[PDB]
């Protein structure tokens, strides 16, 4: 038992948090009432679910989640949701108005009005935990709250509990469903202000998720519901190594131990496979070799990048369902022999396989088909720098003519910090291409 | 929860606001007495943004009838939806500015704006969280212009953090009288360069144009103009008064549209606009709506969008459409008309979808766009106002009211600066 409370900030962060908590309850057999049925004690008495959930005096299980947002409506839906009795009112913190997709508003103007209350609640939750490894943060880059307040919380946690592994999840913007025009601005702002303080970030590519759930899921116009559904699915796929007894990524420090050998290289690639639509749920289940080849294919990758153009740094394989290890080695050898997998010389780190035998569940009535064997591959490659190349030119196209900066300047932060953030991102891409070249 | 205080000034402004309140009340299923006789709660989701309920389902609009002439509220309150407004919001002067900016802003403006601000504070203290103010006024009248300018100035002084958008009804030389109106219009726009965070330009040239040749009416009357501009703001505020994926409130809108502190003027757009002697009994398809909306024949600003480049634009669609073809037609428009969009602000095109269409049309689509083509109205204002300056046309009517020519000089300087800035951003 090693507790890990989670902080959910921003509109998109709260939505994906709702989704992943619903799916956690589904897999763990926890009804919305929160009680623990005798027949639903999934885990064989293991407290690996007690890592995320806290049992009250009446046997009710309460998750260690801190739903934070500056707008009341998104958390009003949580209050009116079917899991209303699952979360205590103290766990959810509401603001009087959102940051309006403005980083300075979510960081400097209105963030400080509730940062103290959020920290008090977090400390209250942490004092009851004796094996607190760290914090998992869910937030959206485009959101003014989801970037500004996320950075403020990250800095506060680092200055307070800097020895804890602060894993993070982020939502990459996408032009089709872009919330605002100023998404590159606050994206780079939070990336600069959180690069040192964060531990390991799992960016979620809204373009990529939209593409995969448009193509494979047989939906022509996916709304937010399906997007956050799939994001919750992949988040739970990642965290299954923590929620159950396993062989790889058992603790939160292991993530940074395996995927972040050095700072600023903490943006590993995530991939989930197979994904099949509910309308075609009766298709043949893909074998281990097929699903491995699928997750190595860019079609099922969930961040828009080309790993073949890049250089792998470190790869780890997570397995859910009945998966034969010998078949795993066969698939790995096949992929290595056919697909040109390149590794840096100075880091001889290989491929790590951790198999969890619990099959993955799906939301009731959702578009995702039940699958008996699924594979989630986490790898770090310099190809992810293509995302930063998407962001930096999008930023420069407006910064050269200095657009939309009057809001940020008037909200109490100096203009020079924009140039500082751009210089930091230039240094980051320099390190990326240096690792890519020096190998 | 993000309630907006709506303020209407001037005779035309008050008429416009009353008609707009009536149409949106009809859209929300509100009777003249304030009770809700609709069918769905989707209109009730964000109904509190503009309305308040007091123990009887009587949704009183958060509207303020302000005008230095008491007869304007007497005429408005006699309408079908004129009595639904809160009686305390009726503030009227006893002297009248007489279509004068100096009297309507300096002396007679203050003696009424003190009470108006008292009313505004009374509404805001009862409002949990207020995001902005809505202003409708006619720049031709010297009363409403001065009142509104004073409102914006002292509101920014009191609430620098509270955003504000306004519906500026730009008059016309061919619509209204032309004696001292250019001076008042110049002063008004000079105030709006810095006082307002957002501004919608409504131009009477294109207004009469659309009301006459597209609506096929021999002699346009102010009632039809009122109806068209009210439908325009219905479409524009569809984003605020209804929920949507974009979730655009006032500050979200300003951030996603205004790229620079001084470039806060938008040109509205409405579709379809059919004459009431040939109105189609069918519904326009997506390509037809697209080619009608982006044409110059659907903008309430008398500006040629082909002359300039679209800085940031958004399109709000109401009705039952398959949005796949909507996104398709928008991307074909972006590819085809790339010369009319500035390339240095990526993703400056926006699409919003709504399910409740306006009455009389099952399908509708409204457009708001920030373009550099609006510099030409500043140019024409300059052509009028400099020609009246070089001869000091009736300047002694403003000197004797405590207003000097230094303010007009600062106004012309700011106008020239805005024209130059728009031209330099064209490239």
């Amino acid at each position: 038992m090693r507790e890990c409370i989670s902080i959910h900030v921003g509109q998109a962060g709260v939505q994906i948090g709702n989704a992943c908590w619903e799916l956690y309850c589904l897999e763990h057999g926890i009804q919305p009432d929160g009680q623990m049925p005798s027949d639903k004690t999934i885990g064989g008495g293991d407290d690996s679910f007690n890592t995320f959930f806290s049992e009250t005096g009446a046997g009710k299980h309460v998750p260690r989640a801190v739903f934070v947002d500056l707008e009341p409506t998104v958390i009003d839906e949580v209050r009116t949701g079917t899991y209303r009795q699952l979360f205590h009112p103290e766990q959810l913190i509401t603001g009087k108005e959102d940051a309006a997709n403005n980083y300075a508003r979510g960081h400097y103007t209105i963030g400080k009005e509730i940062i103290d209350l959020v920290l008090d609640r977090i400390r209250k939750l942490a004092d009851q935990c004796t094996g607190l490894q760290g914090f998992s943060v869910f937030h959206s880059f485009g959101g003014g709250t989801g970037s500004g307040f996320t950075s403020l919380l990250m800095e506060r946690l680092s200055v307070d509990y800097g020895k804890k592994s602060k894993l993070e999840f982020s939502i990459y913007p996408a032009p089709q469903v872009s919330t605002a025009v100023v998404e590159p601005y606050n994206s780079i702002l939070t990336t600069h202000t959180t690069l040192e303080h964060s531990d390991c970030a799992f960016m979620v590519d809204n373009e990529a998720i939209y593409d995969i759930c448009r193509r494979n899921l047989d939906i022509e116009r996916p709304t937010y519901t399906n997007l956050n559904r799939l994001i919750g699915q992949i988040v739970s796929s990642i965290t299954a190594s923590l929620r159950f007894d396993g062989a790889l990524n058992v603790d939160l420090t292991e993530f940074q131990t395996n995927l972040v050998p050095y700072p600023r290289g903490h943006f590993p690639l995530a991939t989930y496979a197979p994904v099949i639509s509910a309308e075609k749920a009766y298709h043949e289940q893909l074998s281990v070799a097929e699903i491995t080849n699928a997750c190595f294919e860019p079609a099922n990758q969930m961040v828009k990048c080309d790993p073949r153009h890049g250089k792998y740094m470190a790869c780890c394989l997570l397995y859910r369902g009945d998966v034969v290890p010998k078949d795993v080695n066969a698939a790995i050898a096949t992929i290595k022999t056919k697909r040109t997998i390149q590794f840096v010389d100075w880091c001889p780190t290989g491929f790590k396989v951790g198999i969890n035998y619990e099959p993955p569940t799906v939301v009731p009535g959702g578009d995702l088909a039940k699958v008996q064997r699924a594979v989630c591959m986490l790898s770090n490659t310099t190809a992810i720098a293509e995302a930063w190349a998407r962001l930096d030119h999008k930023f420069d196209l407006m910064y050269a003519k200095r657009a939309f900066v009057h809001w940020y300047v008037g909200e109490g932060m100096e203009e020079g910090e924009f140039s500082e953030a751009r210089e930091d991102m230039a240094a980051l891409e320099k390190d990326y291409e240096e690792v890519g070249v020096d190998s | 929860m993000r309630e907006i205080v709506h303020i209407q000034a001037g005779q035309c402004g008050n008429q416009i606001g009353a008609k707009f309140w009536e149409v949106i009340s009809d859209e929300h299923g509100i009777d003249p007495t304030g009770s809700y006789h609709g069918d769905s709660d989707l209109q009730l989701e964000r109904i509190n943004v503009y309305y308040n309920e007091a123990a009887g389902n009587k949704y009183v609009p958060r509207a303020i009838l302000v005008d230095l002439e008491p007869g304007t509220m007497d005429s408005v309150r006699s309408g079908p939806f004129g009595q639904i407004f809160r009686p305390d919001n009726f503030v009227f002067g006893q002297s009248g500015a007489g279509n004068n900016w100096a009297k309507g802003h300096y002396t007679e403006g203050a003696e009424l704006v003190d009470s108006v601000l008292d009313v505004v504070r009374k509404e805001s203290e009862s409002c949990d969280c207020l995001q902005g103010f809505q202003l409708t006024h006619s720049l031709g009248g010297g009363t409403g212009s001065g009142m509104g300018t004073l409102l914006i100035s002292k509101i920014r002084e009191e609430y620098p953090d509270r955003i504000m958008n306004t519906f500026s009804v730009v008059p016309s030389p061919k619509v209204s009288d032309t004696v001292v109106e250019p001076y008042n219009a110049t002063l008004s726009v000079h105030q709006l360069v810095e006082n307002t965070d957002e501004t919608y330009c409504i131009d009477n040239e294109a207004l009469y144009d659309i009301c006459f040749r597209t609506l096929k009416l021999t002699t346009p009357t102010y009632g039809d103009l009122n109806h068209l501009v009210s439908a325009t703001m219905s479409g524009v505020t569809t984003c605020l008064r209804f929920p949507g994926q974009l979730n655009a409130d006032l500050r979200k809108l300003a951030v996603n549209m205004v790229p620079f502190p001084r470039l806060h003027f938008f040109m509205p757009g409405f579709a379809p606009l059919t004459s009431r002697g040939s109105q189609q009994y069918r519904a326009l398809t997506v390509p037809e709506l697209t080619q009608q909306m982006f044409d110059a024949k659907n903008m309430m600003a008398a500006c040629d969008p082909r002359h300039g480049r679209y800085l940031t634009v958004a399109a709000v669609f109401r009705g039952r459409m398959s949005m796949k073809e909507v996104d398709e037609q928008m991307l074909n428009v972006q590819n085809k008309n790339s010369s009319y969009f500035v390339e240095w602000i990526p993703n400056n095109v926006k699409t919003a979808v709504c399910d409740i269409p306006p009455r009389g049309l099952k399908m509708s689509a409204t457009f708001i766009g920030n373009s550099t083509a609006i510099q030409e109205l500043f140019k024409r204002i300059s052509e009028q106002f400099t020609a009246m300056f070089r001869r000091k046309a009736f300047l002694h009517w403003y000197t004797g009211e405590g207003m000097d020519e230094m303010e007009f000089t600062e106004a012309e300087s700011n106008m020239n600066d805005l024209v130059s800035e728009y031209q330099q951003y064209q490239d």
């Binding site: - | 030389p173 061919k174 619509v175 009288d177 032309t178 004696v179 009469y208 144009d209 006459f212 040749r213 597209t214 024949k297 024409r380 052509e383 009028q384 020609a387 009246m388 070089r390 001869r391 046309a393 009736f394 009517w397």
Partner: protein
Amino acid sequence: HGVPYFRNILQSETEKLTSHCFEWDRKLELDIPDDAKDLIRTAVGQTRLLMKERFKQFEGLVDDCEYKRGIKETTCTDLDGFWDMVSFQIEDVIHKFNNLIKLEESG
């Protein structure tokens, strides 16, 4: 300048604009394309709007300058400036007439 100059140019402008109006409505009888019909209609309607609204009020101002009747006094230079602001719109409308002619000669 003088006031009979104002009256003379006023009647000249009204006469030419109305002559344009008659030729436009006379040519509208043929099945010219709907876009051209709309443009011609807008032009003639804008001309008539300037007729009833601009020109009647402006001749009211000529009466103001002549009889010294009304709210306050007015001089001839104000009338000159007024003719300039009418003049940009008249140049505009004759330009629109020119483009209508160009469209007509093209079809």
